[PDB]
Amino acid sequence: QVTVIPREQHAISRKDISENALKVMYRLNKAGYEAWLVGGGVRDLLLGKKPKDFDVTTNATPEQVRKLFRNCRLVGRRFRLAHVMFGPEIIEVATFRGNIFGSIEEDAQRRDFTINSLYYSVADFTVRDYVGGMKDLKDGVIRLIGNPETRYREDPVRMLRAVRFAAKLGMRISPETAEPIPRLATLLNDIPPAHLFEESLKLLQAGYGYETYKLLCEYHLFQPLFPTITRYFTENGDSPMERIIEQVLKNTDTRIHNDMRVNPAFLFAAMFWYPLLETAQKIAQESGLTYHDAFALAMNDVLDEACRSLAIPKRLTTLTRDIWQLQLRMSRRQGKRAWKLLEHPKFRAAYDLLALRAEVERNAELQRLVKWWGEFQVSAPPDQKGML
Amino acid sequence: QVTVIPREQHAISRKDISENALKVMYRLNKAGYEAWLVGGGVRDLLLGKKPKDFDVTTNATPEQVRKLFRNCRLVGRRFRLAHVMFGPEIIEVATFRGNIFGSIEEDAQRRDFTINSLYYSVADFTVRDYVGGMKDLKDGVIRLIGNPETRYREDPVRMLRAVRFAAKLGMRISPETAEPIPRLATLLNDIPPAHLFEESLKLLQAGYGYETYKLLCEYHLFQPLFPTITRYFTENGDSPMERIIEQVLKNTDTRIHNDMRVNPAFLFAAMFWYPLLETAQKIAQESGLTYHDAFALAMNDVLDEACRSLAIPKRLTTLTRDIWQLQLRMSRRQGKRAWKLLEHPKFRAAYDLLALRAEVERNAELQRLVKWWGEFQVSAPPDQKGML
Ligand SMILES: [Mg+2]
Ligand SMILES: [Mg+2]
């Protein structure tokens, strides 16, 4: 058991890679308080990689953190936890917890996993490890902190997080941490769908999506979130839907690493596609009506019951409705309206779906439509005219 | 002589082809004033096409108009002319003019051209013609009202208008109205660059551009507006600049006849391109700087001289510079920095310009970066990955 690591034993964590929340700590340190660097950032630093956040903690009460910074720009609210602003770097300043506000050792125990629970002191260049930490981090192990059994019951979402970190760093989940998930997964249904929607994005949409879906599938965590989707999985292994989902995820992933921006309205529009299509089949051959009005129904429903687990915001659903709408429109080869279409704000997305639709089905009459719209959109107006 | 023409014998501008700004004439009629439809609208109606506006004129004081329409959504300001709103519809309601104002006939005289000064009443279905009006309409003639010489001096923009209508409608400028133009052309230099900008757009961007240019050139009206460009014309008639200024105008025109949003800042960035290219190279030898630094100066230069005639908005000058800059970036066979580029807001315009640049110079080198970028921009991240 090693509770304090000296800077000369702990990987660089060189004071010079800490941007300047340094100013935020030195200020506290000057005032008879303690300033520690917790969680995400301090993990990464030890890891070698570049911190994306810098969060700090202190034995200073939240009203004591208030006075010391009444002159600075403090962004809003939140019990405990204060928000400091430079600009394109905001710094989180949280008071230790335990009756309510306690010690560093106390605070370490209410933190979900090991590595995300290392602490750094500018004041002593030491990192504090009241937990597995340093070893877990070295061995590459996502270990939970209290008794898995009970923690997952208090906050089930911890279970999702477990996988998420599992995929983003190349690490494995501790056996005792792993055992309970498949049994307890269903517990995510007692979760406010909104909260789930956030974690759906943190999982797929943060550029690890593919590896995180593999892990979400291997622990039956995928199913409580996307029941409309699980249902159309197949024994064989790789139907058209099961291919698209992999692909859109690998791509959504590639875009993030090349630093593109990305549409979440898209990722859903892709994944629920084939289900929408299936529901269009049954809706038409049964209860016989036109394919158009049928399809329209399939949307409301697919989206209704999906929106029953994740709470997709009215905004995204409505763009999705459009990316699907375009799928039909683009299908019928025709003229004049084409300009009207190319103009559509969600066109770029709609094209990228048709892209997938044709890659996965390997249906060459789509890949046909795909070359046509490919050329119609990079082509200049005299030739655009000639294509109709 | 032939001053009042009845519903049957006029190309029945049928009461049914008036947008319910009929509701606004009615309140005026019902209330004891008369109310007539003028110009823009009544001209297109008699011609058959769908009007783009409906302006009504009345003999109510601007003060009496203000009172009668209190219950209404009347958008403010501007002596005389009064404005009324509905949905996507605004209805211009101006008093007649003449101490200041008086009889319908007194008004017809301060209007610039014949055809735009026909009057229609829904109260009688008669159109009043107190000028060549009807006959000129039939004959296909833009004819100034009073004494050309005097009027063009009173307002030089009447000159541009004349050439604009000439081009948009398909008709000839009457002799007595054409003679003074080439002489008085310069007169435009005495006018705020603001106005010249406004009108510069009604001429080239309204989707008649090309024809309106063939005219602006044939009347030495082009030069006062684009000193910088005129200077670069060539007797041959086939320099790459001249080709481009034609093409871009044609293309802009096509865009407008297929209801596309058109970019103002593109147009300019296309015309001045070659003057920018030229002023650049001259700065390159005349004063041995790197080409990259040279260029940015040349941008500054080309822009102030043009700003010296047209009051181009700081808004649109930023966009233009950006479109041009991208022209260097896209030339370097850039690697992974490309993703960032693909993302630029302006990239579509930059691309559309590299587009032309290849088409007019009939260069193969460039024609390649066009085929390349054409693909990289529609490909999927797998494919796209590869290309780099
Ligand atoms: Mg944070
Ligand atoms: Mg008007």
**3-class SS string, A11-61:** CCCCHHHCCCCHHHHHHHHHCCCCCEEECHHHHHHHHCCCCCCCEEEECCC
Distance from CA of A240 to the nearest CA of B (A): 18
Distance A197 CA to ligand 1 centre (A): 18
What are the structure tokens assigned to B266, written together? 């593109």
Burial B267-292 (b: 16+ CB within 10 A, else e): bbbbbbbbbbbbbbeebbeeeeeeee
Contacts A371 to B, Cβ<8 Å: none
Distance B237 CA to ligand 2 centre (A): 37
Distance from CA of B274 to the nearest CA of A (A): 20
Helices A264-271 and A347-361 sit at what angle, rounded to 10 degrees? 30
Ligand index nearest the alpha carbon of residue A92: 1
Distance from CA of B319 to the nearest CA of A (A): 20
What are the structure tokens assigned to B336, written together? 């992974």
What are the structure tokens assigned to B163, written together? 């050439």
Task: Decide if B53 is catalytic.
Answer: yes
Residue of B nearest to A342 (CA): B260
**Separation between Cα atoms, residue B218 and residue B181, nearest integer Å:** 10
**Separation between Cα atoms, residue A248 and residue A354, nearest integer Å:** 12
Give the up-direction half-sphere exposure of residue A129: CA atoms within 13 A in the CB hemisphere: 20
Ligand index nearest the alpha carbon of residue B56: 2
**Burial (CB count <10 Å: 0-12, 13-18, 19+), residue A30:** exposed
**Burial (CB count <10 Å: 0-12, 13-18, 19+), residue A73:** exposed
The number of helices, as runs of H, and strands, as runs of E, in chain A is: 22, 9
- Kindly report each contact of residues A36-40 with a partner whose C-beta sits within 8 Å and lies 24 or more positions away, as own/partner: A36/A104, A36/A119, A36/A120, A36/A121, A36/A128, A37/A119, A37/A120, A37/A121, A37/A122, A38/A94, A38/A111, A38/A117, A38/A118, A38/A119, A38/A120, A39/A111, A39/A116, A39/A117, A39/A118, A40/A116
Question: What is the rounded end-to-end Cα distance, in angstroms, of chain A?
Answer: 75
Count the neighbouring beta carbons within 10 Å of the beta carbon of residue A101: 15
Backbone angles phi, psi at B9, to 5 degrees: -85, -15
Contacts B343 to A, Cβ<8 Å: 260-261
In this complex, do B340 and A259 lie within 8 Å of one another by their Cβ atoms? Answer: yes
Distance from CA of A272 to the nearest CA of B (A): 20
Residues 333-352 of A with CB under 8 A from B: 336, 339-340, 343, 351-352
CA separation (Å) from A215 to A170, A218, A231, B168, B357?
Answer: 12, 5, 18, 65, 51
Tell whether B378 is within 8 A of chain A (Cβ): yes
**Separation between Cα atoms, residue A72 and residue A84, nearest integer Å:** 7
Dihedral class, residue B34 (left if φ above 0, else alpha if ψ from -120 to 50, else beta): beta
Distance from CA of A310 to the nearest CA of B (A): 27
What are the structure tokens assigned to B5, written together? 């023409």
Ligand index nearest the alpha carbon of residue A38: 1
Distance from CA of A49 to the nearest CA of B (A): 21
Looking at 3.10.450.750, 1.10.287.610, 2.10.109.10, 3.30.460.10, the CATH number of the domain B1-140 comes to 3.30.460.10
Helix (H) or strand (E) holding B15: none
**Separation between Cα atoms, residue B355 and residue B353, nearest integer Å:** 5
Distance B332 CA to ligand 2 centre (A): 47
CA separation (Å) from B130 to B85, B113, B134, B140?
Answer: 30, 12, 9, 17
Ligand index nearest the alpha carbon of residue A116: 1
Domain ranges of chain B: 1-140, 141-388
In this complex, do B382 and A261 lie within 8 Å of one another by their Cβ atoms? Answer: no
In this complex, do B380 and A374 lie within 8 Å of one another by their Cβ atoms? Answer: no
Question: Tokens 């908005």, residue?
Answer: B313
Distance B53 CA to ligand 2 centre (A): 7
Nearest by Cα to A200 from A156, A161, A154: A161
Contacts A355 to B, Cβ<8 Å: 380
Burial A331-344 (b: 16+ CB within 10 A, else e): eeeeeeebbebbeb
Q: In what side-by-side order are the strands of the sheet with B119-120?
A: B4-5, B127-128, B119-120, B35-38, B55-58, B90-95, B83-85
User: What positions of A carry a catalytic annotation?
Assistant: 53, 55, 112
Nearest beta carbon to residue B251 from set A250, A377, A382:
A382
| DSSP characters over A257-323 | HTT----HHHHHHHHTHHHHHHHHHHHHHSS---HHHHHHHHHHHHHHHHTTTS---HHHHHHHHHH
Nearest by Cα to A357 from A334, A328, A388: A328
**Separation between Cα atoms, residue A202 and residue A51, nearest integer Å:** 17
Distance B185 CA to ligand 2 centre (A): 25
- Could you tell me if A224 and A190 are in contact, meaning their C-beta atoms sit under 8 angstroms apart? no
- Experimental determination technique: X-ray
In this complex, do A251 and B336 lie within 8 Å of one another by their Cβ atoms? Answer: no
Measured on CA atoms in the order B21, B24, B26, B32, is the torsion positive or negative?
Answer: negative
| CA R_g for chain A | 25
**Separation between Cα atoms, residue B380 and residue B382, nearest integer Å:** 5
Catalytic annotation, pick one of B44, B112, B136, B253: B112
**Separation between Cα atoms, residue B272 and residue B239, nearest integer Å:** 13
- Could you tell me if B138 and B129 are in contact, meaning their C-beta atoms sit under 8 angstroms apart? no
| DSSP characters over B29-97 | HHTT--EEEETHHHHHHHHSSPPS--EEEESS-HHHHHHHTTTS-----SSS--EEESSS-EEEEEEP-
Is the fold of A1-140 the same as that of A141-388? Answer: no
In this complex, do A378 and B381 lie within 8 Å of one another by their Cβ atoms? Answer: no
**Separation between Cα atoms, residue A73 and residue A210, nearest integer Å:** 39
Residue of A nearest to B350 (CA): A378
**Separation between Cα atoms, residue A330 and residue A84, nearest integer Å:** 49
CA separation (Å) from B38 to B59, B287, B373?
Answer: 13, 59, 50
Distance B5 CA to ligand 2 centre (A): 25
**Residue A82, beta-bridge partner list:** A93
- Kindly report each contact of residues B21-27 with a partner whose C-beta sits within 8 Å and lies 24 or more positions away, as own/partner: B21/B54, B21/B56, B21/B84, B21/B89, B21/B91, B22/B122, B24/B56, B24/B69, B24/B84, B24/B91, B24/B93, B25/B56, B25/B122, B25/B123, B26/B122, B27/B68, B27/B69
Helices (H), B219-363: 227-230, 240-257, 264-271, 273-285, 291-307, 314-329, 338-343, 347-361
Looking at 1.10.3090.10, 3.30.2130.10, 1.20.1250.20, 1.10.1040.10, the CATH number of the domain B141-388 comes to 1.10.3090.10
CA separation (Å) from B351 to B268, B331, B346?
Answer: 15, 11, 8
Contacts B385 to A, Cβ<8 Å: 254
- Could you tell me if A60 and A68 are in contact, meaning their C-beta atoms sit under 8 angstroms apart? yes
Regarding beta strands B141-142 and B127-128, do their DSSP bridges make them parallel or antiparallel, or are they unpaired? unpaired
Residues 251-280 of A with CB under 8 A from B: 251, 254-255, 258-261
Nearest by Cα to A273 from A245, A250, A301: A245
Residues 54-113 of B with CB under 8 A from A: none
**Separation between Cα atoms, residue B47 and residue A167, nearest integer Å:** 69
Distance A92 CA to ligand 1 centre (A): 7
Nearest beta carbon to residue A251 from set B355, B356, B380:
B380
Which residues lie below 8 Å from residue B298, measured CB to CB, with a gap of 6+? B276, B279, B280, B283
Distance B226 CA to ligand 2 centre (A): 26
What one-letter code names the amino acid at A179? E
- Could you tell me if A116 and A125 are in contact, meaning their C-beta atoms sit under 8 angstroms apart? no
**Separation between Cα atoms, residue A145 and residue A151, nearest integer Å:** 8
- Could you tell me if A336 and A258 are in contact, meaning their C-beta atoms sit under 8 angstroms apart? no
**What single DSSP character describes residue A89?**
E
In this complex, do B251 and A351 lie within 8 Å of one another by their Cβ atoms? Answer: no
Q: Give me the resolution in angstroms, 1 decimal.
A: 3.0
Contacts A352 to B, Cβ<8 Å: 380
Greatest Cα-to-Cα distance within chain A, rounded to the nearest angstrom = 76
Task: Decide if B301 is catalytic.
Answer: no
